[PDB]
Design a protein around this ligand. Structure first.
Ligand SMILES: [Cl-]
Ligand SMILES: [Zn+2]
Ligand SMILES: [Zn+2]
Lengths: 187, 188
């Protein structure tokens, strides 16, 4: 299911089957994603003409890898910073291969926790079109108390169409989207 | 075992369990390595003053990830190129966290399978010090018949000291190092 809610309150199932994977294009290293996600990511980049401008920074990440990422951030940035920007192991969308971190292509010395993705024409254009290919901005600037994560302009979650367009037009989080669908079921 | 021989003729056993991992520094994305490898990698980069110049491109992959890499290259680049530069699933040193792919910063091109790591002052400086921190150049230029892999200037393998120093000084591959040790126990 592409609409699955993964977060602090909704951790992935211990018993969940691992996702299907393929290697994704438009990165400078090996990044893996669910096939449909890779496919729509590629379509999105080609349609916007951003092959030269943006790069895929991070994709599928095992639970153990997520734990190591968190532990690194703790040692380097401290607990409070880490809780802000890194999902707890088992609570990360990266573990199911539906999330991408995106960055700029010639941004040297970029940060792995918080890839630079603002104040550039490539980022703006990407934000104009991503919803048309199944992606939403997962952690918007004024939704911290709902998502539990600070503003992350580099992090995108695949939900597929028309969900991405519906969510983006209401400036919703995936959390609010799920509550809306639950409410509308009772009819 | 930091000397473990992994290639087409010596695949990983499926019972072997996974290496311990840490997130490695000096990269723009998340890369994981065995703790001692990351520690030595970090020491190496600092001592050579190559922080601004080089970067860690790839490290640990699962067999599943290795398979997806193999399959992609097969599809995109064809069997010939893929056989040359990509180890078969079960036959890649990346699966045990002892291998790093290293690339140059300030680049406007690098193939996905083959990170640019030649024609550079930083590459040269790196090639002079890496053995003093546990690393060997895994797939040298005229050893393709022995390693079963074409020349890969970017791929380094951690074996630890003094093994890396001994191997590099003889211009051996890990394959040849193993023969050397076996021949030596054979003359006892
Ligand atoms: Cl698959
Ligand atoms: Zn992310
Ligand atoms: Zn390699």
């Amino acid at each position: 299911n592409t609409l699955q809610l993964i977060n602090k309150n909704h951790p992935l199932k211990k018993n969940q089957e691992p996702p299907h994977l393929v290697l994704a294009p438009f990165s400078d290293h090996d990044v893996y994603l669910q096939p449909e996600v890779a496919k729509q990511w590629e379509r999105l980049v080609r349609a916007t003409g951003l092959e030269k401008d943006i790069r895929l920074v991070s994709g599928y990440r095992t639970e153990k890898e997520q734990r190591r990422l968190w532990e690194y951030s703790l040692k380097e940035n401290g607990l409070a910073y880490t809780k802000q920007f890194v999902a707890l192991p088992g609570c990360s969308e990266h573990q199911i291969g539906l999330a991408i971190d995106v960055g700029l292509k010639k941004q040297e010395d970029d940060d792995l926790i918080c890839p630079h993705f603002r104040d550039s024409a490539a980022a703006d254009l990407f934000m104009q079109q991503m919803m048309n290919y199944g992606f939403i901005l997962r952690y918007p600037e004024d939704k911290q108390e709902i998502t539990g994560i600070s503003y992350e302009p580099w992090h995108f979650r695949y939900v597929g169409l028309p969900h991405s367009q519906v969510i983006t037009a209401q400036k919703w989080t995936l959390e609010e989207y799920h509550d809306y669908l639950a409410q509308t079921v009772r009819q």
